[PDB]
Write a protein that binds this ligand. Structure first.
Ligand SMILES: Nc1ncnc2c1ncn2[C@@H]1O[C@H](COP(=O)(O)OP(=O)(O)OC[C@H]2O[C@@H]([n+]3cccc(C(=O)O)c3)[C@H](O)[C@@H]2O)[C@@H](O)[C@H]1O
Ligand SMILES: Nc1ncnc2c1ncn2[C@@H]1O[C@H](COP(=O)(O)OP(=O)(O)OC[C@H]2O[C@@H]([n+]3cccc(C(=O)O)c3)[C@H](O)[C@@H]2O)[C@@H](O)[C@H]1O
Ligand SMILES: Nc1ncnc2c1ncn2[C@@H]1O[C@H](COP(=O)(O)OP(=O)(O)OC[C@H]2O[C@@H]([n+]3cccc(C(=O)O)c3)[C@H](O)[C@@H]2O)[C@@H](O)[C@H]1O
Ligand SMILES: Nc1ncnc2c1ncn2[C@@H]1O[C@H](COP(=O)(O)OP(=O)(O)OC[C@H]2O[C@@H]([n+]3cccc(C(=O)O)c3)[C@H](O)[C@@H]2O)[C@@H](O)[C@H]1O
Ligand SMILES: Nc1ncnc2c1ncn2[C@@H]1O[C@H](COP(=O)(O)OP(=O)(O)OC[C@H]2O[C@@H]([n+]3cccc(C(=O)O)c3)[C@H](O)[C@@H]2O)[C@@H](O)[C@H]1O
Ligand SMILES: Nc1ncnc2c1ncn2[C@@H]1O[C@H](COP(=O)(O)OP(=O)(O)OC[C@H]2O[C@@H]([n+]3cccc(C(=O)O)c3)[C@H](O)[C@@H]2O)[C@@H](O)[C@H]1O
Ligand SMILES: Nc1ncnc2c1ncn2[C@@H]1O[C@H](COP(=O)(O)OP(=O)(O)OC[C@H]2O[C@@H]([n+]3cccc(C(=O)O)c3)[C@H](O)[C@@H]2O)[C@@H](O)[C@H]1O
Ligand SMILES: Nc1ncnc2c1ncn2[C@@H]1O[C@H](COP(=O)(O)OP(=O)(O)OC[C@H]2O[C@@H]([n+]3cccc(C(=O)O)c3)[C@H](O)[C@@H]2O)[C@@H](O)[C@H]1O
Ligand SMILES: [Mg+2]
Ligand SMILES: [Mg+2]
Ligand SMILES: [Mg+2]
Ligand SMILES: [Mg+2]
Ligand SMILES: [Mg+2]
Ligand SMILES: [Mg+2]
Ligand SMILES: [Mg+2]
Ligand SMILES: [Mg+2]
Ligand SMILES: [Mg+2]
Ligand SMILES: [Mg+2]
Ligand SMILES: [Mg+2]
Ligand SMILES: [Mg+2]
Ligand SMILES: [Mg+2]
Ligand SMILES: [Mg+2]
Ligand SMILES: [Mg+2]
Ligand SMILES: [Mg+2]
Lengths: 203, 202, 203, 202, 203, 202, 202, 203
């Protein structure tokens, strides 16, 4: 509309054919098209029909449309606790970049080896908004929130077994931090966090 | 320091004397905000800090005349019902103590949604919107879909039965984050205003 | 019996062969036969044995028997929040039509774009009973309940990931509305809601 | 207005003075029903509204002589045990204040199911049945399978331990909706009568 | 031992080859051998090695050893609410018969059509112990418990979708009955209920 | 009637006067047992029933001299700790009022399991064993594996934190039913003795 | 006996007289430690044991002058906030009564993590570390990753809302056990010091 | 580092190719390499690339590096309640042995037949640390804790059906014991318990 936000397809409840119909209908509008939670088998069914589509395997995201050059004099930090958080981390990063934001990835800096976090603390503190992504104990959000004076958006992930409860423990831990200045989204919702981060970053 | 934020005392686990001790030590540190301060604890505290202002509904205490706002924008504090007013006023008083303009849009739940559209101009003009609701957390979803500004949802613990002291409102809000919505802990109006302040003042 | 209600088969705990035996035994009685939660592979095993059966792919329902012409001077509105709710939405609509009710589908009017709801508010308010079907935040039920002065039956769906909890959050949200005038059924139970709606509509 | 429904005050989060203020403002709006009103709050309210009727068991207050019923049919209020009577009487008083005939079928739980069949003629003759039960929510399932009329099940919070303040009764009732059963929130006898009234008066 | 109870194999955590080793080792002892939760594919791997084994498809149980003639002047009633409860119902019935008990099956008498229950109430009341098996609302246990003056053992089943929660709701309902004289076992544990019923029946 | 069981009043939701009314109506019905009767409610009740016996720990009241036991066997009431004694004594007093011999084997939890083996002869000689435990429900599993008699496990609500007012003890006991174990609701010593009585007297 | 451990009374479910009775019976059994002893129960107990020491914050009571420590190493008792001090002091007093040196590292939560690194030399020098925290249980994860010594995490029940009386802190700590972390029940500072004592004294 | 602890790979969130890259990079460092939760199909993809790797099928663990000779004058007891606990039991035992500890396995001594436990009580009491591993009712931890005056670490397993709740009941039971002297780890985390046991054993 009057806002520059791209169209977003939730490719989970839609089939690969439904998506091609939704994409082809909105390919005559404007902006770019972002599709989240799009399986690798679904993009195979998409590659002939949408030959201009770019698939980001790790993020399970698909973008059709030239990525916008960065539009704001700042960057968003996407901070991850472990490599298992990378899929939802890349979902947020691809979302933030599709929305026109510079993204600095600070991956695999969980508190199990907290020295890695302080080595990249200069990068995290320089961002305008920090997205912290973690599963299991999700303790990294609390540590980051107490160390940066910038808006932090915490993303709980469903990574882990046992008492991780498909992300519920990470969610409860991060909500109990809220070390102030932390705000939380639903489990695995890297897109939603990047949506909010983009609005904060683009002020 | 170095960030511009006033000092914050979490006066729940502290006695009326401990709070007076923290204030006198901080008489070189802006204004002082004290959250979650009961009236019975403020009565014992009123003879000690004669310049202190108590916000009964917010259960908050301010120690020092606030200067002008730091930023010309405003934060919108939106509530679904009058029962949400305590944590709303906690968020509103926190945001104002941090130097933010606050416009209160109270009691506009979706049971009578016409009240919400009447105040939609005020909400959309805000730089950040804090939506506060209990029981059904539906107000966050409606606001999030109607404003293209950051929304921070605060679930309240109002209600019995299946409201589960805010647990249902919290889960409802978390499932609306695909909009511009982000969520804080139950009743944490302070935390919401803390993040809202940072977004508004950048 | 003395009531016009059709026979209903719960084709979930029965195999495609058991269903043909249950159908063939009741095909000498009266009324129509409705079978819910009937997989697409199960209807394939049914098509030779029951050549008069009609399968509604989206609803996962099977009807054997001429659909009754509408029997009451009113219609039931089946209102859905998103396209992912369509399977259980069609389960309710096929049930309500099998019971002899006119059905007006008002699909994909979730509160993410609430303007779509008011565009079809005339249709919803004209119904005698409204079935509201939604997953995730299930907030649409509360919004509809406050806007219509007719009995509303809310159906929580198991659509969604994370903290949706296979419909539990939608269920709790709708139960906490009950904006008065809302009544709730079990997760994904579009049939049960249409059963109650039919009784209200047929008074 | 425009719907025929009396005004409803949720007198739980309001003080005895606030309720009297809402009534005097509404002295142009039918009868006035006030739900969830404690006796300690009604005592302070009794000198203010001398024409008011208090239903002790229902914790409800009515402000105005009810006219005749609007419809010749009746709503059946069915309870499994005497402990369910408060929320039952809340539902019964609400339904009568909305202009519905109410036949009470109380204390007919399945522990002694012979009581249920003795009153089955009254239940089946109803236009709508509200079934109210706690602990095991089994009465809803039995009634739902025995009547071909809309059933609205109300779980109550009676009991300790694994009753979980109505959570088990609620889950039991939700899993009986394949019958003619539909469910409301725990203890929400008002909401059940509200929907029952609409079904009965169409 | 000094008690006549047969050996019981929990064929869930054991593979079809492990079971043949456990069976062959105890086939030189005494009594019969009962194996519960034994998949249909596992009995295929068992049929060559154990050619004297009998598989009860519905119960997912396997018995090696001549079934004992009834040993007590009474019978146990195994009462079921719906056909979906039949697998765990047959698990209890095969267990009770392997332990030397007469079993009277009263199947598919749920409260949705309660008239079926009273038609077989004479049979249920004549038993020395009643095993009530039900899922979803598990309300049948409460109804049976109030109608019979005999020990009742309630078995919650994991049948159902939505808010049935894989048997948790049935379990909570039955525990809240305990209409006195009802006692409860773990979800789907028809064996454990028949174990206790056998001890009560054999006094 | 027709079953030999004494009349049972659930005196929790009833007042001291209501209970006296039920007793006088039942003065043609065996002994009368009243469960879950507080001492403050029994004090108001003591002048009314001067022949009544109160069991303080069990919170139970008996109205009539019990005849001899009906059956020579005995029910074993086994507890893991002294905190379980109230619901244990409720089960013991219920079983004795129903005409069963009761042997109490109290405070034999697995923290000091040597106490359990010292009293194993008494437990194994029982016709039915009621095992009562809170926190870790481990005593049921140990007893169930050691006796070839019906075991009825009663979880108690003793403890805070992750005991969850008996929820953990309940889940532990339910997962031991592969032994000779069957389970009742939290704190339901009455229900356990009710079933135990039926097994013992057949 | 035979293990060197002092006798431990769980004084929560016992009255001030019962505890004095257990002590007089134990006057041949080391020092006597009594945990979870309220001040109102200790006031009635103070005239009875005039040699007894009460630790108000720990709600613990010691009966006998402790000899020297048994082992030259020390146990570190680490807390995230001042609200954790009661269960921390319960753990500290228990560990000292069992003959262990205790170094308290209090109020070093990750909200201000600089306090933690300032005291890291003391924590790393410990033979066993007990980490005690509520709300977010993040302090256990940070400590577990920073020390190569056994860590025993104690969740506390501080907080409302989604802290769930320690349930969230407990789940957070359990998901950090891949470090050197092991977990005890909510608020169980005694149990943590009990295991810590065994590790420290081997 | 200065500590002798081996490198540990969490082979759950990594693919068989990622693991070969992580292993080959750390095969030029020191100590042994332990990889937990490594599927049997993943080791097949590993056997050509890592020909010196040893796979322990039951433990789902992989070790590359000569196992260290025992380094402390004591042994750790790994005590199990049932055969279904053996996978996580062997995960702990392989971890403890990779860390340089003698391990005494006391398997299948659940309280259903408690006499088996006392027969091996001499072995359990002689250990410096006891790891108790149990699912379902996890009652064995409480029984062991009251019988030994040594540090006990309880591991809840996700074995079982119904109300076992994938290990939650065992976890809650063991936490409620903490019979003092018991300490608890997350569900199925035999590695984490052996990590702590190794530190206690190596003092
Ligand atoms: N069997 C086992 N179960 C659980 N953890 C085990 C393990 N064996 C080793 N580990 C250890 O777990 C660690 C992570 O495994 P890795 O291979 O690197 O995998 P990684 O991606 O780094 O971690 C997986 C999950 O743990 C979460 N995490 C870890 C640490 C801290 C935080 C935080 O909240 O700050 C979050 C993280 O968000 C992610 O979702 C490793 O150091 C490894 O030694
Ligand atoms: O008197 P009464 O007005 O019932 O009570 P009221 O104070 O206005 O609110 C009661 C609770 O219901 C919640 N509510 C009501 C209506 C709509 C919504 C929403 O989320 O849209 C929420 C509200 O957040 C509040 O916590
Ligand atoms: N990664 C992501 N995770 C969650 N949501 C994401 C998303 N990316 C975009 N979205 C957004 O979610 C929205 C829905 O996705 P779509 O493609 O249209 O799919 P849709 O069928 O419309 O929604 C799926 C579920 O969301 C429920 N819902 C949505 C909105 C409001 C309400 C209500 O309670 O009123 C309920 C609805 O009941 C349904 O069960 C889209 O606007 C999309 O932009
Ligand atoms: O005295 P007492 O009669 O025990 O107590 P009572 O007041 O009759 O009821 C106690 C609770 O048990 C519930 N109950 C009892 C019996 C049957 C059913 C059912 O749902 O069928 C429910 C009932 O809803 C009530 O909330
Ligand atoms: N979409 C749907 N979802 C849920 N139920 C639906 C349905 N469509 C019809 N139904 C109705 O559900 C009923 C059962 O289905 P059916 O084909 O016969 O299958 P059935 O085996 O009889 O029942 C399946 C489960 O419901 C449980 N149940 C049912 C009724 C009472 C009780 C009790 O606790 O007494 C328990 C029973 O224990 C079993 O585990 C049918 O009458 C059918 O009309
Ligand atoms: O004083 P203190 O003796 O701690 O307290 P105590 O009264 O003996 O019991 C406290 C709770 O721990 C439970 N417990 C303790 C020991 C073993 C077991 C078991 O189930 O084996 C249960 C017991 O059921 C009781 O509810
Ligand atoms: O005053 P205020 O200082 O808010 O309160 P405080 O007493 O210091 O602690 C409040 C709760 O927050 C918890 N907390 C706070 C900060 C960090 C961590 C952590 O786990 O790192 C935990 C802490 O365990 C405590 O239970
Ligand atoms: N249908 C059934 N459902 C559940 N249990 C059934 C059963 N049929 C027999 N059983 C019995 O369950 C027992 C175990 O089965 P098995 O073949 O040996 O298999 P097993 O590995 O020994 O036990 C499986 C699970 O039960 C747990 N368990 C069992 C006993 C005690 C404890 C404890 O906490 O001390 C824990 C154990 O940790 C393990 O995770 C057998 O004696 C068998 O007779
Ligand atoms: Mg990693
Ligand atoms: Mg911050
Ligand atoms: Mg309002
Ligand atoms: Mg928005
Ligand atoms: Mg849609
Ligand atoms: Mg309405
Ligand atoms: Mg009654
Ligand atoms: Mg019906
Ligand atoms: Mg059936
Ligand atoms: Mg009975
Ligand atoms: Mg004791
Ligand atoms: Mg047994
Ligand atoms: Mg602090
Ligand atoms: Mg460590
Ligand atoms: Mg075994
Ligand atoms: Mg010990």
């Amino acid at each position: 509309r009057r806002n520059g936000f791209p169209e977003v397809i939730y490719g989970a409840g839609k089939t690969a054919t439904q998506i091609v119909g939704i994409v082809q209908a909105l390919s005559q509008q404007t902006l770019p098209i972002l599709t989240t939670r799009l399986s690798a088998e679904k993009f195979a069914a998409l590659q002939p029909a949408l030959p201009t589509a770019v698939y980001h395997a790790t993020a399970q995201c698909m973008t059709v449309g030239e990525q916008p050059a960065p539009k704001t004099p700042g960057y968003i930090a996407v901070v991850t606790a472990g490599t298992a958080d990378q899929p939802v981390a890349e979902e947020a990063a691809v979302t933030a970049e599709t929305f026109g934001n510079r993204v600095e990835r600070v991956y695999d800096v969980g508190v199990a080896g907290i020295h890695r976090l302080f080595a990249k603390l200069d990068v995290i503190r320089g961002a305008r908004v920090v997205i912290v992504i973690a599963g299991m104990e999700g303790a990294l959000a609390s540590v980051v929130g107490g160390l940066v004076d910038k808006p932090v958006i915490a993303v709980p992930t469903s990574v882990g077994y046992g008492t991780s409860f498909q992300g519920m423990t990470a969610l409860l831990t991060m909500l109990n931090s809220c070390a102030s200045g932390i705000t939380v989204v639903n489990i695995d919702n890297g897109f939603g966090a990047a949506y909010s981060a983009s609005m904060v970053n683009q002020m």
